[PDB]
Amino acid sequence: GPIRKVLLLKEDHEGLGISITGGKEHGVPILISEIHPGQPADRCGGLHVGDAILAVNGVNLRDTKHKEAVTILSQQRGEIEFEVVYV
């Protein structure tokens, strides 16, 4: 489908509530494999298992290795914009 931009609100004591797989070294996007119930990703209601995370807060993750992408994602705070597309 189309690119969507979705806002997630994460409190400082919370994680994002996603499992992510993929990355440049695998020739696939950064992908959401699980959405954990009640955590910020679930609450925003705009993200699905199978979504590729193209960018977070304007950080392009289309050509980044797994670990680096996870690091960038885990550094995000507050109101976080995900640019996603369903694969």
């Binding site: 499992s19 990355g23 695998h26």
Partner: peptide, 15 residues
């Protein structure tokens, strides 16, 4: 539907 490379068993992180 079907076979997407992005569905294959790959290293995963929980965040």
């Amino acid at each position: 539907w079907x076979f997407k490379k992005a569905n294959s068993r790959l290293p995963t992180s929980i965040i």
